[PDB]
Amino acid sequence: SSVHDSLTHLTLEIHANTRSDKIPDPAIDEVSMIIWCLEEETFPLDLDIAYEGIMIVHKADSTFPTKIQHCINEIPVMFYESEFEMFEALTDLVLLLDPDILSGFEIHNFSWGYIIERCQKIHQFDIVRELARVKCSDTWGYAHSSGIMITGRHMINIWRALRSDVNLTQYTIESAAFNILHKRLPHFSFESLTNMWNAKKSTTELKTVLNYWLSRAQINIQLLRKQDYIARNIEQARLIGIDFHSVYYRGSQFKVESFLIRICKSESFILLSPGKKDVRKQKALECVPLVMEPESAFYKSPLIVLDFQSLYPSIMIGYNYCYSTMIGRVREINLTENNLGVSKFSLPRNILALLKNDVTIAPNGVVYAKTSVRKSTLSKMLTDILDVRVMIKKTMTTLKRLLNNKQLALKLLANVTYGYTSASFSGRMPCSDLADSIVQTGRETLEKAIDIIEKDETWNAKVVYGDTDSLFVYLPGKTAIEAFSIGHAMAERVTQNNPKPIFLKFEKVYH
Amino acid sequence: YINKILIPPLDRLFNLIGINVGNWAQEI
Amino acid sequence: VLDIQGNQPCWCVGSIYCEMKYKPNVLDEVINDTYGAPDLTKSYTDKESDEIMLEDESGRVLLVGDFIRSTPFITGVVVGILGMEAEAGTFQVLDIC
Amino acid sequence: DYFRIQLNNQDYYMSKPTFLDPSHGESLPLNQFSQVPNIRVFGALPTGHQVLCHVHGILPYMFIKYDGQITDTSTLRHQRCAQVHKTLEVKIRASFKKLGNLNFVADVSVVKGIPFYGYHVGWNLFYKISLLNPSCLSRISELIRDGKIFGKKFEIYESHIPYLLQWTADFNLFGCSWINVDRCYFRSPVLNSILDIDKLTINDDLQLLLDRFCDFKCNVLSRRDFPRVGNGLIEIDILPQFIKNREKLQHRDIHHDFLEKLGKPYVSSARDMINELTMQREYKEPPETKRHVSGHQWQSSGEFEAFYKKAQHKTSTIPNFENFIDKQKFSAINTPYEALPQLWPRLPQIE
DNA sequence: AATGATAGGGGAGG
DNA sequence: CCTCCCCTAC
Ligand SMILES: Nc1ccn([C@H]2C[C@H](O)[C@@H](COP(=O)(O)OP(=O)(O)OP(=O)(O)O)O2)c(=O)n1
Ligand SMILES: [Ca+2]
């Protein structure tokens, strides 16, 4: 077909016989079944592999493989005398397909982790060094990600990905399948599975366990596909520019650093790298967001909800707030030594007099250069990402999915951008003054909006609740049909009293 | 279960109106 | 069942395996009175069939032919199939006991 | 017409300097390098064939403040770079437990730049300390910042950015994107015969690509010097000159003076996205006429204005836009994006 | 080994 | 009143 612009995906599952409800331990209980599923939609080269397979240990009596073959009759099954040969065959299969991602459900104490532990502890075989694409500890890795590190290939823990994606009580294969794929799967205890697997007769039981594990393996691909996790992560990586591993393993500051270094490298900018001690000894944050306690009561009349769109990004775009735009705190401006966050510097001789007009003092008290002398870099980044997001949203099946993935990635990047500042702890390039300015001017904008809304006599409305950018205005007995017009009018009035990127949206009402 | 799972949240929601849910539960 | 392999007639005794899916009306009736019954039609559509096997505690073989078609069968019923293997693990049917 | 490899995964390792790697530097050319870093790229061809790529000549670097004066005659800069290189090498060798076979620092060079943490308008001189082992770069930065190396503490620039991120950003690379390269070097037999993959994976398109890019006469490296290390299909070795993803970057130097005050997206990924959307299909968005305040007056604006007037009266000694910054040509000093082409070894041929 | 800020509320236990 | 823990809003 067309060119290959996706990542190959392979999933694996393990069945191990337990011993009277002991949750099979990877040191006493051996592997028996390595049912694996390979994603077909994104796999090129059209090779005869059938995209599916089952591996079963059989010492070899003379009827078990034949019975299994007839009861399956669809997927080829390979039988091995020992689990070491079965592991070697699995390694050969991985080296043949050479998948980009090896995944599974709860891969720490199960299939991938179980195989790794069995190979390392019992057989003294380093399966990790053999499954890599190169011939020749991670507490954070196991905390909220996959702790397995195989060279070349990415390990994806499906349950963690779904936990980060969808919020629901409990996280099991059955619950996820029912709440995502609308499939109900019977669940059998380990003792029962061992009993069916140890029954020489009753082909029905063998077919039952085989279909059990086959469905468990197959449903993983559908779960990752319906949420479109792989494609969304690939699109986000292409947008930000970080590798596929850093999309989910690294933190939010990594993406912001990537954008910043990519933008600044074209403008001959040199980024400062403060130490941990410098960040620890910097001035603490003083400005806090404005939240008002609502009047706890039941509101019969319609309640219009107003919410600013990207309040902080719009603030930084409009007010030109950046690292390269701070001149200094308006109080205590010395020509010898100053203080701005984690750095000290000295102003030139006649800098203030030269730019006495093209500056804008922040609410916190920090002088910022106007756009007429220097356009800030963060404003450039935020306006570019916002323009791209609104363009793709305005344009908006495959193209629709790609546009949705791009929209989500752009929203995530824009939201994480502000978090780069105000990083008092575990911050690699923080700036207390910039974050304080942003929060304070957000508070001022909120107060101005509230005053404008309350001032109008024709709108006998009063603000009852307030958040970082949320306004709850109450219209006592105001026939909600016309409440939409009033809400649109106040949104337009508030918008027309702010710089260009600042915008207010009505978007809903509570009768 | 009744008291310590339903009385607190229903009381938080309905004390704004001005009614005590616990009185309703007392009669049963 | 695994001993019937060759170009010679042979007979064996085993139970009959069939599909026997439920009728949709029964499924609707049991779903409407369970309060949480899943989409049981998915259990029949996922598999997506028309064949008869012979299970005798050692495996199954497909009962192809015409004598086996013109007889209603229910799963779990044992019979005395007497036929000949022709070209695969499929067993022909000539007489039934 | 370009060899295209997707950025699926990346890693780095230390190897001995071959004829495809830099062996010396400009500060201390006499002393060679004990080891050099190499970046491994795990990618797949557009036809679907996995390719392993080794990247040579890419070195991590960090910037520290230049101590000398801007009135150098292009000769004292080299001497100062040599002295600081020797001091760094000695101090790291002593702390980490005749000076030859450099193991930590490759070379030190002087590059211009504009600081980012604050408002700066003029060119500032910086050192470019290129290291050999990127893993210990954080340790070197900590030692320099803590005053263990020199007699005074020095601020560190561009040390929180990892080596892989620097390499990707310098050459205009994005994750899961094509690495458009025109020339490559092949290794031990291209169609690997691990078990049988030299027959199943091969197709017409793969053979056409090999015929277009592989010559088997002056392209395949020697078997003895460069054995395969990848358990996959065809493996290539690349040089920094070969990567043509760069040269599409728009370099601007408008921040060295008040160019803006006198008479297209800034992210190339966004440019690619909008190009794709235009190819898929005009686009417009009518704005709203906003009449803001005269100066957006706030509660504590008067005190701020008074303090600004006091500060302006304090630091003053009539400045003009065209005559504020001093007009030091700084033509000899290399631009940061004009400095990474340095240290690229050669265009060798050892066939 | 890696981690972006701040603000509110409830519940158990001592 | 105190700390500890859960976890949702922005
Ligand atoms: N995880 C978060 C969520 C929000 N905010 C801050 C940034 C916003 O400027 C402000 C408002 O948050 P919103 O939830 O309203 O999101 P936005 O206003 O930024 O965009 P949108 O309105 O489209 O949701 O709160 C933050 O710092 N971190
Ligand atoms: Ca909002």
Side-chain angles (χ1 to χ4, degrees), chain A residues 2-4 6-12 14-19 23-29 31-45 50-58 60 64-68 70-72 75-77 79-80 84 86-87 89-91 93-99 101-105 107-116 118-119 123-125 128 130-134 138 140-141 143 147-148 150-159 161-164 166 168-182 184-190 192-197 199 202-217 219-233 236-260 262-266 268-275 278-280 282 284-292 294 296-330 333 337-343 345-348 353 357-359 361-369 371 373-374 376-378 380-383 390 395 399 408-410 414-415 417-423 426-432 434-435 437-439 441-450 453 456 458-461 463-466 469-477 479-480 482-491 493-504 506 509-511, chain B residues 1-3 5-16 18 20-25, chain C residues 1-4 6-18 20-27 30-38 40-45 51-54 58-65 67-83 86 88-94 96-97, chain D residues 2-4 6-10 12-15 17-25 27-31 33-63 66-68 71 73-78 81-85 87-88 90-95 99-102 104-124 126-128 130-141 143 145 147 149-151 154 156-187 189-193 195-203 206-210 213-216 218-223 225-233 235-240 242 245-246 249-253 255-256 258-259 262-263 265-268 270 275 277-278 285-287 289-290 295 297-298 300-302 304 306-308 310-312 315-316 319-321 324-325 330-337 339-345 347-348:
Chain A
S2 178
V3 304
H4 189 236
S6 44
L7 299 184
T8 52
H9 183 203
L10 181 67
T11 310
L12 195 142
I14 299 299
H15 166 67
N17 283 13
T18 192
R19 65 185 184 273
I23 279 177
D25 186 74
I28 297 95
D29 281 319
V31 187
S32 283
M33 304 200 44
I34 304 176
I35 296 172
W36 56 268
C37 277
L38 171 81
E39 200 162 274
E40 162 164 10
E41 181 176 20
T42 66
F43 189 73
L45 274 183
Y51 303 97
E52 281 211 37
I54 299 179
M55 307 157 160
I56 303 180
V57 174
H58 188 59
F64 203 103
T66 308
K67 182 190 303 179
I68 292 303
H70 312 327
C71 74
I72 294 298
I75 296 91
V77 178
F79 300 91
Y80 311 97
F84 197 62
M86 181 195 48
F87 291 153
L90 175 61
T91 301
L93 163 74
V94 170
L95 294 186
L96 166 65
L97 293 181
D98 190 359
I101 295 91
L102 297 171
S103 77
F105 185 78
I107 55 175
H108 282 149
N109 283 7
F110 278 116
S111 57
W112 286 115
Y114 200 97
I115 285 180
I116 290 169
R118 283 289 301 181
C119 293
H123 300 285
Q124 314 204 349
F125 177 47
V128 192
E130 301 282 346
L131 290 182
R133 320 162 52 105
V134 174
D138 209 5
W140 185 240
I148 307 177
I150 295 187
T151 300
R153 320 184 195 279
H154 307 287
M155 296 284 316
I156 293 190
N157 205 359
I158 291 192
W159 84 266
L162 274 298
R163 202 252 299 172
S164 298
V166 65
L168 73 164
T169 69
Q170 277 292 129
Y171 291 97
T172 58
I173 175 67
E174 298 91 16
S175 158
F178 185 78
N179 284 317
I180 300 178
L181 303 175
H182 310 299
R184 175 62 68 188
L185 314 165
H187 179 277
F188 307 136
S189 79
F190 287 117
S192 65
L193 296 161
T194 298
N195 294 331
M196 291 156 257
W197 195 240
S202 164
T203 310
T204 306
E205 285 173 347
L206 302 185
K207 184 175 181 179
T208 300
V209 288
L210 275 160
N211 283 129
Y212 184 102
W213 288 116
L214 192 61
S215 46
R216 294 313 156 85
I219 288 168
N220 294 341
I221 303 286
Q222 305 182 37
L223 281 178
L224 285 188
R225 175 59 183 82
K226 181 174 283 292
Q227 304 265 7
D228 213 7
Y229 183 82
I230 308 296
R232 192 176 30 224
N233 276 34
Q236 187 203 113
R238 290 183 190 184
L239 171 60
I240 292 163
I242 52 179
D243 50 354
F244 184 87
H245 184 222
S246 295
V247 169
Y248 56 90
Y249 188 96
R250 292 300 297 267
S252 84
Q253 291 184 261
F254 199 55
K255 318 161 168 58
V256 189
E257 280 177 0
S258 158
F259 285 104
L260 274 187
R262 284 179 159 85
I263 292 190
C264 298
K265 266 172 173 323
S266 89
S268 283
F269 265 119
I270 303 296
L271 264 60
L272 180 68
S273 298
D278 306 326
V279 178
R280 194 201 320 292
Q282 84 168 340
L285 291 171
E286 49 185 69
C287 292
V288 298
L290 170 58
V291 287
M292 65 179 288
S296 280
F298 166 70
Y299 292 91
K300 324 182 281 153
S301 291
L303 192 71
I304 289 180
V305 169
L306 300 184
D307 202 10
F308 284 88
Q309 291 182 357
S310 296
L311 177 58
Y312 288 171
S314 47
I315 278 169
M316 306 170 273
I317 292 168
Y319 287 101
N320 210 42
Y321 289 163
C322 180
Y323 299 88
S324 65
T325 49
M326 296 163 298
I327 303 185
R329 292 188 296 272
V330 71
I333 297 192
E337 181 144 10
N338 290 318
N339 196 358
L340 263 188
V342 298
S343 87
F345 66 109
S346 63
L347 274 297
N357 298 127
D358 303 0
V359 296
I361 303 185
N364 187 24
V366 186
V367 187
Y368 288 83
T371 309
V373 293
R374 162 176 291 184
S376 68
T377 60
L378 281 72
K380 273 161 151 169
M381 194 205 324
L382 276 296
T383 193
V390 303
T395 303
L399 61 83
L408 295 157
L410 289 153
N415 287 127
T417 298
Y418 160 70
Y420 197 29
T421 61
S422 69
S426 78
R428 293 179 292 173
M429 188 157 99
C431 193
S432 178
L434 190 64
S437 178
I438 291 161
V439 178
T441 185
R443 174 193 293 277
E444 309 301 354
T445 296
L446 194 67
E447 288 176 336
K448 298 259 173 40
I450 296 191
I453 277 171
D456 203 5
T458 181
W459 305 330
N460 63 7
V463 190
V464 298
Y465 183 51
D469 57 352
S470 296
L471 287 86
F472 283 23
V473 294
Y474 190 52
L475 297 167
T479 174
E482 67 182 2
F484 290 84
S485 66
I486 297 187
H488 281 64
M490 32 175 68
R493 179 164 303 184
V494 173
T495 304
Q496 72 188 14
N497 284 115
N498 283 270
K500 299 289 298 183
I502 304 190
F503 181 76
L504 183 59
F506 160 80
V509 70
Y510 291 161
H511 193 302
Chain B
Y1 313 81
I2 285 182
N3 299 328
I5 304 176
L6 309 173
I7 296 305
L10 290 173
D11 269 344
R12 279 196 294 271
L13 279 169
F14 284 153
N15 283 18
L16 306 193
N20 224 338
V21 182
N23 303 336
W24 297 351
Chain C
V1 190
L2 300 195
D3 303 358
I4 61 170
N7 54 77
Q8 65 182 357
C10 48
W11 59 270
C12 75
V13 175
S15 78
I16 285 291
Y17 165 72
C18 278
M20 293 177 70
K21 295 183 292 185
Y22 268 116
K23 280 190 176 179
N25 44 287
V26 183
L27 293 185
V30 298
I31 278 178
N32 293 17
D33 287 328
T34 314
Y35 187 71
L40 299 175
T41 316
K42 299 179 64 63
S43 280
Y44 296 153
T45 54
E51 61 76 13
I52 307 177
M53 311 215 178
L54 187 65
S58 161
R60 310 171 192 269
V61 286
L62 266 72
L63 296 188
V64 298
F67 198 89
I68 202 74
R69 281 299 181 179
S70 158
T71 301
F73 276 102
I74 298 296
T75 188
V77 177
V78 311
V79 294
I81 301 299
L82 181 140
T90 59
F91 202 53
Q92 211 173 342
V93 176
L94 266 70
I96 306 185
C97 294
Chain D
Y2 278 59
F3 211 72
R4 287 187 283 182
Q6 204 175 42
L7 273 167
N8 304 341
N9 199 26
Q10 50 177 336
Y12 71 97
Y13 73 104
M14 311 275 318
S15 73
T18 63
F19 80 102
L20 293 179
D21 295 296
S23 48
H24 63 108
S27 54
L28 303 182
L30 270 299
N31 315 322
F33 299 151
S34 281
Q35 262 186 349
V36 296
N38 293 148
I39 306 179
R40 314 194 272 219
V41 184
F42 307 93
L45 277 169
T47 67
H49 302 89
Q50 294 298 321
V51 179
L52 171 58
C53 195
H54 300 268
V55 193
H56 307 272
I58 312 305
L59 282 73
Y61 53 89
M62 65 182 179
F63 305 92
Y66 184 67
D67 57 88
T71 60
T73 178
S74 176
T75 317
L76 282 72
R77 43 178 74 251
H78 294 88
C81 289
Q83 305 264 10
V84 299
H85 192 310
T87 301
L88 294 174
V90 164
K91 189 52 72 213
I92 317 304
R93 285 177 177 178
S95 178
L99 197 147
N101 301 317
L102 310 168
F104 299 95
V105 180
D107 65 341
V108 172
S109 63
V110 175
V111 298
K112 71 179 74 165
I114 299 158
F116 186 69
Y117 209 96
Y119 181 78
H120 305 75
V121 67
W123 278 125
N124 285 25
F126 292 92
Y127 275 134
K128 190 177 180 176
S130 313
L131 301 181
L132 287 178
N133 191 14
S135 49
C136 59
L137 188 145
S138 86
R139 181 175 180 268
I140 314 294
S141 68
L143 294 174
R145 204 154 39 205
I149 318 291
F150 307 93
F154 272 66
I156 314 300
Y157 296 83
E158 298 216 9
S159 68
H160 59 286
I161 305 178
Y163 169 53
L164 306 181
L165 190 53
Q166 284 187 359
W167 164 67
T168 45
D170 276 322
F171 287 87
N172 189 359
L173 298 179
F174 295 88
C176 285
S177 292
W178 293 119
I179 302 177
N180 310 301
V181 55
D182 62 330
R183 194 193 198 162
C184 66
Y185 273 109
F186 287 95
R187 282 208 177 198
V190 287
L191 275 297
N192 196 352
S193 44
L195 72 165
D196 204 81
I197 76 168
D198 53 355
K199 270 86 72 177
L200 278 78
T201 46
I202 184 169
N203 277 299
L206 181 65
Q207 187 63 42
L208 284 168
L209 259 177
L210 275 296
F213 283 91
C214 189
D215 200 69
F216 264 121
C218 66
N219 189 179
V220 181
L221 296 178
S222 75
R223 208 84 72 213
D225 302 338
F226 295 86
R228 287 182 66 105
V229 298
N231 287 323
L233 212 59
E235 173 180 347
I236 56 181
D237 292 332
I238 198 168
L239 291 203
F242 299 157
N245 291 110
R246 69 191 315 262
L249 298 164
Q250 316 286 15
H251 294 293
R252 301 171 304 271
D253 50 354
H255 305 321
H256 80 273
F258 301 102
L259 271 298
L262 264 293
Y266 303 103
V267 188
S268 64
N275 283 5
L277 275 296
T278 61
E285 171 67 30
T289 311
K290 304 183 174 60
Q297 283 322 303
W298 314 325
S300 63
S301 284
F304 291 163
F307 285 143
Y308 184 75
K310 175 292 181 183
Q312 177 183 346
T315 186
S316 279
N320 186 34
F321 276 130
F324 189 80
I325 193 66
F330 291 155
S331 293
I333 297 100
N334 276 114
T335 307
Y337 49 75
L340 64 95
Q342 202 53 258
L343 282 75
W344 294 356
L347 182 53

